[PDB]
Amino acid sequence: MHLKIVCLSDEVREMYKNHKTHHEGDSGLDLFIVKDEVLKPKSTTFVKLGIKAIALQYKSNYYYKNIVNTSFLLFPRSSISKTPLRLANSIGLIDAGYRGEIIAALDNTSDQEYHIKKNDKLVQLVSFTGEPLSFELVEELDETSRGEGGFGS
Amino acid sequence: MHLKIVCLSDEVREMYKNHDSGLDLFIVKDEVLKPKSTTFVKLGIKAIALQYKSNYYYKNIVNTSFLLFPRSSISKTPLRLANSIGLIDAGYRGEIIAALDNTSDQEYHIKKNDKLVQLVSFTGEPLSFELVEEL
Amino acid sequence: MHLKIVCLSDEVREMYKNHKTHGDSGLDLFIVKDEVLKPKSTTFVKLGIKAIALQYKSNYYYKNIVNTSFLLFPRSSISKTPLRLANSIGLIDAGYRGEIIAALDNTSDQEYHIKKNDKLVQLVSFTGEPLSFELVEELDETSRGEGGFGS
Ligand SMILES: O=c1ccn([C@H]2C[C@H](O)[C@@H](CNC(c3ccccc3)c3ccccc3)O2)c(=O)[nH]1
Ligand SMILES: O=c1ccn([C@H]2C[C@H](O)[C@@H](CNC(c3ccccc3)c3ccccc3)O2)c(=O)[nH]1
Ligand SMILES: O=c1ccn([C@H]2C[C@H](O)[C@@H](CNC(c3ccccc3)c3ccccc3)O2)c(=O)[nH]1
């Protein structure tokens, strides 16, 4: 599976240009926390990840009664387990047509505020097939304004 | 992936007659979830999933296993799916149930027509469905 | 999907030789020793096994049998307990050689006793295809694979 990722700021672009934990073969792509943020105790926070993405896979014939955009998954990283933060929707399902910012809905199970920091890695993108992932940085996902493409401001 | 769905009452049939990687499932009856609880919420349907046969390593159409995901909008409630993602094995013929944890210190009211969970294929392929009398 | 499983003790080998729970999409994994989980805690519970998953090679877009990634799911029956899988679903990458661990949140205000033979989690293929398994002594020639020259 190949991800095309639009970074929503120069700061975010710099993070993904120097991605330090992605290796050839990996089934998950770590995503960064992109801004220091305080998560309220016993709360759900919709944490913006500063990127938009599409996933590309080979077309397949499927029962329903070359390369195509496909749905993909947002998993917690195993290392989230040492924190009090949990993914509210368990596993995120990003449909093939979504052009919005990728968000992690994080439950803070602690009675204390939780500080997340730029460069923390709490979630990862994954293919439905679990196949190795590649990615590249692009300026737009498609021609639409939500896709960050097309004419004008 | 194609689902054949048995609705377990005419009220439920009505909901699915008047109903993409996930197929939203409805809460089919108003219900109060106790504070700090797990409730097995019955969804009033049985279902089998059909996909093309594949050669797999071990040791035309087949019924296959499928998944029960939370909807992303569950996040806006205090309810969480207890078993994370439900696995419905190919052999299952029972009613589909969502095990919902109410993390609130107060009771939570779910209503008929609420959509908290969805059925998903292992491949994330588009889903179709039809209503049947029998699996 | 076919799993090659290394059991890390004879006690664990005894369990998997006599499985009893296993065309199924999930392979149940055992709790392998009695353990007490503290209240309001996350415990990294060691499952006493290492495992590689094998599938037929498939062509994938990226810019005969192979090692493949696989998943650690809670069992549906975990729902009746106060235990929850901290990371939702575990992702085990192709060829991973460490002991498989279940990170379990005890959401109770009471300590929770897990017991040898309890089944709380299961291994699952990304395709949901039936699973087979066999017991092996090593995954590869490396010490982390439990193989190769000893001492
Ligand atoms: O885990 C997910 C799952 C889906 N989506 C995409 C596809 C979905 O179509 C979209 C839903 N946005 C919701 C929202 C709800 C739960 C988790 C994330 C996002 C939302 C955004 C901002 C505030 C409050 C809720 O996000 C996502 O970004 N992350
Ligand atoms: O999330 C799931 C996972 C599996 N199943 C199917 C296939 C599994 O083989 C089966 C387990 N049924 C149990 C049960 C226990 C926990 C969560 C859901 C369901 C049950 C049966 C009767 C009453 C109340 C609960 O349900 C399901 O309906 N939902
Ligand atoms: O649920 C999972 C997911 C991945 N892994 C494998 C593949 C992952 O690559 C690996 C992550 N190991 C971590 C760890 C952290 C949380 C939960 C489990 C495992 C670890 C354990 C003990 C000490 C230090 C770290 O475990 C696993 O054993 N169980």
Q: Which domain range does residue C105 map to?
A: 1-136
Residue C41 inside a domain? The answer is yes
Contact C28, C75 (CB under 8 A): yes
The residue whose CB lies within 8 Å of the most ligand 1 atoms, and thus the one to mutate among A99, A101, A103, A146, is: A103
Q: What 8-state DSSP symbol labels residue A16?
A: H
Amino acid letter for position B79: L
For tokens 């027509």, name the residue: B113
Name every chain A residue with its beta carbon within 8 A of the beta carbon of C90.
78
For residue A54, give the CATH number of its domain. 2.70.40.10
- The total number of structural domains that make up chain A: 1
Residue C150 inside a domain? The answer is no
**Whether the CB of A74 sits within 6 Å of ligand 1:** yes
| Alpha carbons B22 and B126: distance in angstroms, whole number | 8
Q: Is A79 helix (H, G, I), strand (E, B) or coil?
A: helix
Residue A148 inside a domain? The answer is no
Residue C144 inside a domain? The answer is no
Residue C145 inside a domain? The answer is no
Q: How far is CA A127 from CA A28, A67, C71, C148, in A?
A: 8, 15, 12, 34
Contact C136, C53 (CB under 8 A): no
Q: Is A112 helix (H, G, I), strand (E, B) or coil?
A: coil
| Alpha carbons A115 and A85: distance in angstroms, whole number | 11
Tokens of C30: 């055992």
Contact A91, C89 (CB under 8 A): yes
Residue C141 inside a domain? The answer is no
CB neighbourhood size of C51 (10 A): 22
| Alpha carbons C44 and C34: distance in angstroms, whole number | 14
Please name the method used to determine this structure: X-ray
Q: How far is CA B28 from CA A111, A114, B43, B103, in A?
A: 35, 37, 6, 21
- Distance linking the first and last C-alpha atoms of chain C: 34
Q: After which residues is chain A broken (C to N over 2.5 A)?
A: 65
Contact B70, B117 (CB under 8 A): yes
Dihedrals phi, psi of C141, to nearest 5 degrees: -80, -5
Tokens of A101: 């910012």
**Whether the CB of A89 sits within 6 Å of ligand 1:** yes
CA A58-A64-A66 angle, 5° bins: 20
Tokens of C36: 């007490």
Strand (E) or helix (H) holding A14:
helix A10-17
DSSP-assigned beta bridge partners for residue B7: B45
Tell me the nearest-neighbour CA distance from A60 into chain C, angstroms: 11
Tokens of A135: 């990615």
To one decimal place, what's the resolution in Å? 1.6
- Subunits close to A (at least 3 CB pairs below 8 A): B, C
| Alpha carbons B43 and A153: distance in angstroms, whole number | 47
What's C10-73 look like in SS3?
HHHHHHHHCCCCCCCCEEEEECCCCEEECCCEEEEEECCEEEEEEEECCCCCCCCEEEECEEEE
B97 CA to centre of ligand 2 in angstroms: 5
- Distance linking the first and last C-alpha atoms of chain B: 16
| Alpha carbons A86 and B26: distance in angstroms, whole number | 25
Amino acid letter for position A78: S
